Design a protein around this nucleic acid. Structure first.
Length: 330
DNA sequence: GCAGAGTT
DNA sequence: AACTCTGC
């Protein structure tokens, strides 16, 4: 999910790009969102469903990555931060209800750990390196972008910006939507957004770490952050103070139309929660400096894997592998 | 405060 | 087509 309307606000800075512009670059790829999407499969066959669709999509996307001379570093999620789980609990408390938590995590754990073993097997056969992030994989990609270990990161999760990412390629594994390239420098110089502003935007709009303010979108959020200017987390403190005294027997000394609009919307009794900004500023990553290597694939292991998990014969796997090996010449 | 308008 | 955000 990421941040609610962050991509809408940032889109003025992005640059449309042909997939051949990623040729040659080393890039990290968050895979844990692919497994969380092919968790319970899809019935796309004209009469039935697929067995291991996560492996199938992984294979197709590995083929597309190698077709464009990309050198990917896959990053797997680790544990979930406490705030992520609490927000997934409060977003599950709205289960369409009007007028069993210890057996769901334990099933998700083992099912996703088997998906992990399968995916890592396929990645090893393709000779591409991967890393098990300690908690968050988007922060683990951001720390690689910052340390100049990658030329960017392929992801659609806007929340990576809040972890300090600098270069991002988005809509790459989308067919109809053009690939788009975003640089922190460009939208910093355009929109005046640094990391702290983006974190306050996550406070207002909502993310996996906190639910936002029900009325506000990116426009109202930017109007707020520009109406209470400050450093770091100060703007939200000023906003909370002003809103508490605003909802204190009021009756007006020419409040700006934005402040006429903000007295309406409601706030959580604990807003703001500095643990959110802390979890975005100082997350858990591998500070290690890596030396990544990309091995040559071997078609026999790949064909055995394809036959064991999808039931493909040599001439189908080979047909879907013809262009990849064609490009991998020098 | 209403409906135009962007999104899934 | 509903859901939601926001200029008029």
């Amino acid at each position: 999910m990421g941040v609610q309307g962050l991509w809408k606000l940032l889109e003025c800075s992005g640059r449309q790009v042909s997939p051949e512009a990623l040729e040659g670059k080393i890039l990290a790829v968050d895979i844990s969102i692919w497994l969380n999407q092919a968790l319970k499969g899809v019935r796309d066959r004209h009469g039935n469903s697929i067995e291991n669709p996560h492996l199938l999509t992984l294979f197709h996307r590995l083929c597309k990555l190698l077709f464009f001379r990309i050198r990917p570093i896959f990053v797997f999620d680790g544990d979930a931060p406490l705030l992520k789980k609490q927000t997934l609990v409060k977003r599950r408390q709205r289960k369409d209800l009007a007028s069993q938590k210890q057996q769901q995590e334990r099933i998700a754990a083992t099912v996703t750990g088997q998906m992990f073993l399968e995916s890592q097997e396929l990645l090893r056969l393709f000779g591409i390196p991967y890393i098990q992030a300690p908690m968050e994989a988007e922060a683990q990609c951001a720390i690689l972008d910052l340390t100049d270990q990658t030329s960017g990161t392929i992801t659609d999760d806007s929340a990576i910006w809040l972890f300090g990412a600098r270069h991002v390629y988005r809509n790459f594994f989308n067919k109809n939507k053009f690939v788009e390239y975003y640089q922190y420098v460009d939208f910093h110089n355009q929109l005046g957004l640094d990391r702290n502003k983006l974190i306050n935007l996550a406070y207002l709009l909502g993310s996996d770490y906190t639910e936002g303010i029900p009325t506000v979108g990116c426009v109202t959020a930017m109007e707020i952050l520009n109406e209470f200017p400050g450093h770091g987390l100060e703007p939200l403190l000023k906003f909370s103070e002003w809103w508490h005294e605003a909802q204190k027997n009021p009756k007006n000394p020419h409040d700006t139309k934005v402040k006429k609009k903000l007295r309406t919307l409601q706030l959580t009794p604990g807003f703001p929660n500095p643990a959110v900004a802390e979890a975005y500023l100082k997350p858990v990553v591998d500070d290690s400096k890596g030396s990544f290597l990309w091995g040559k694939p071997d078609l026999d292991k790949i064909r055995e894997f394809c036959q064991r998990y999808f039931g493909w014969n040599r001439t189908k796997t080979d047909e879907s592998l013809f262009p990849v090996l064609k490009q991998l010449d020098a």
